[PDB]
Amino acid sequence: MAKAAAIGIDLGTTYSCVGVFQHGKVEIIANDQGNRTTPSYVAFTDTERLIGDAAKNQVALNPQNTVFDAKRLIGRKFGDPVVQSDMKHWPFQVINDGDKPKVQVSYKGETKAFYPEEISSMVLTKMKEIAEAYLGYPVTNAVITVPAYFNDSQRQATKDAGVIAGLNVLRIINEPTAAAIAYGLDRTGKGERNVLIFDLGGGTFDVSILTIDDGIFEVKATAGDTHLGGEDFDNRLVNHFVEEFKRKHKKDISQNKRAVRRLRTACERAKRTLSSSTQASLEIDSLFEGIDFYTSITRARFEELCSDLFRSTLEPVEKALRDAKLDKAQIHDLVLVGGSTRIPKVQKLLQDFFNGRDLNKSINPDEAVAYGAAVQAAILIKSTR
Numbered sequence: 196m197a198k199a200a201a202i203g204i205d206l207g208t209t210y211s212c213v214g215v216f217q218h219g220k221v222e223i224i225a226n227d228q229g230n231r232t233t234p235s236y237v238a239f240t241d242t243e244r245l246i247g248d249a250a251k252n253q254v255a256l257n258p259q260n261t262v263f264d265a266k267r268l269i270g271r272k273f274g275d276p277v278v279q280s281d282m283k284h285w286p287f288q289v290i291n292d293g294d295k296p297k298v299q300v301s302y303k304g305e306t307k308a309f310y311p312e313e314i315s316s317m318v319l320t321k322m323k324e325i326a327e328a329y330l331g332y333p334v335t336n337a338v339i340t341v342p343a344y345f346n347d348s349q350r351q352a353t354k355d356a357g358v359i360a361g362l363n364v365l366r367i368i369n370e371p372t373a374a375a376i377a378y379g380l381d382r383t384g385k386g387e388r389n390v391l392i393f394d395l396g397g398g399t400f401d402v403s404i405l406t407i408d409d410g411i412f413e414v415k416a417t418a419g420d421t422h423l424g425g426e427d428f429d430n431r432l433v434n435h436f437v438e439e440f441k442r443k444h445k446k447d448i449s450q451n452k453r454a455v456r457r458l459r460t461a462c463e464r465a466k467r468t469l470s471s472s473t474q475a476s477l478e479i480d481s482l483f484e485g486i487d488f489y490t491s492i493t494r495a496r497f498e499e500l501c502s503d504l505f506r507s508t509l510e511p512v513e514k515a516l517r518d519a520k521l522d523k524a525q526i527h528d529l530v531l532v533g534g535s536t537r538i539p540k541v542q543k544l545l546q547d548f549f550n551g552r553d554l555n556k557s558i559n560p561d562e563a564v565a566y567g568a569a570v571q572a573a574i575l576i577k578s579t580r
């Protein structure tokens with residue numbers, strides 16, 4: 196029953212996703228708000244702890260006690276220059292406990308501090324409960340994914356997050372490996388198969404090159420930008436619309452925190468529409484000083500607004516190829532991961548770089564990692580019997 200069942204969890208920087216492989220198919224499990232992905236957010240309020248959508252939904256109202264980006268801290272020492280640099284950009288406090296970072300917040304009127312694995316365990320507990328509500332029984336066996344570049348300390352702290360969350364961690368597998376498994380790229384028989392995974396998420400960009408030799412995965416190269424993602428594109432739309440409001444009304448809205456956040460969420464939404472329509476409409480009632488902001492933008496203008504950022508995704512692709520010592524024509528498969536890979540200009544830039552090549556994109560790119568993890572979790576639990 197429950198003991199013969201296992202889930203796959205993509206514990207993402209900005210979003211997490213849970214899948215289950217049963218009756219010959221993967222089911223990506225929708226949360227209680229009907230969302231197939233859940234924000235990797237934990238909010239501490241005057242009455243409760245919120246996880247996911249409810250936590251992300253109140254971020255503007257409670258920024259000091261709304262934790263996100265715990266994955267950027269997990270398995271790292273406080274003195275790590277990555278931690279010291281990132282800390283300057285978070286509204287929540289990060290403290291030092293014997294060279295280990297802890298996120299410090301106010302919860303039920305009291306000061307509490309949590310290890311990154313404790314924050315990540317609350318996100319994992321949510322994914323576990325989402326799977327349990329779907330299945331109708333508790334599932335505790337899980338495969339959890341991590342970036343291919345995670346070292347041993349980061350892998351161990353992710354496993355620890357799983358244990359705190361009440362999960363039996365069958366295996367910690369690499370995100371690009373789970374994505375290649377999702378497409379069955381490890382079951383093409385014999386011979387070395389070179390796979391490039393192009394993963395453009397909400398806050399990070401990862402390029403991975405893998406060689407699959409008779410089911411055995413080998414990481415040949417990892418490249419990318421840990422601070423490039425979908426939210427930078429939301430921000431480029433924000434600056435455009437702030438400048439358009441100034442042209443129409445001779446008013447600068449950039450200092451009105453509420454106006455900027457309402458514009459930001461509307462921009463994120465319009466950006467998604469621009470992936471399947473050639474225009475998107477913004478409909479903001481009383482954006483600033485009672486002024487409605489009913490406007491639109493073409494996909495052509497959005498592409499211009501992010502042109503440099505879209506083009507910058509090709510440098511880590513080239514870098515990964517040189518590190519792996521492979522030319523473009525030596526790559527057998529191209530895989531899209533991360534919601535931002537739905538952007539047509541991004542697909543076009545990658546396909547053109549690979550000389551008109553087809554892309555593996557039939558699986559929801561924000562779901563491919565959990566999909567593969569769910570497949571692996573099923574194989575692993577079956578071998579355990």
Ligand SMILES: Nc1ncnc2c1nc(Cl)n2[C@@H]1O[C@H](CO)[C@@H](O)[C@H]1O
Pocket residue numbers: 209210395396397398424425426463466467468470533534535536537538561
């Ligand atoms: N249809 C889409 N067109 C463009 N961007 C998208 C789309 N869907 C998602 Cl999710 N994202 C973005 O992916 C990230 C999460 O993986 C977020 O930045 C989200 O906006």
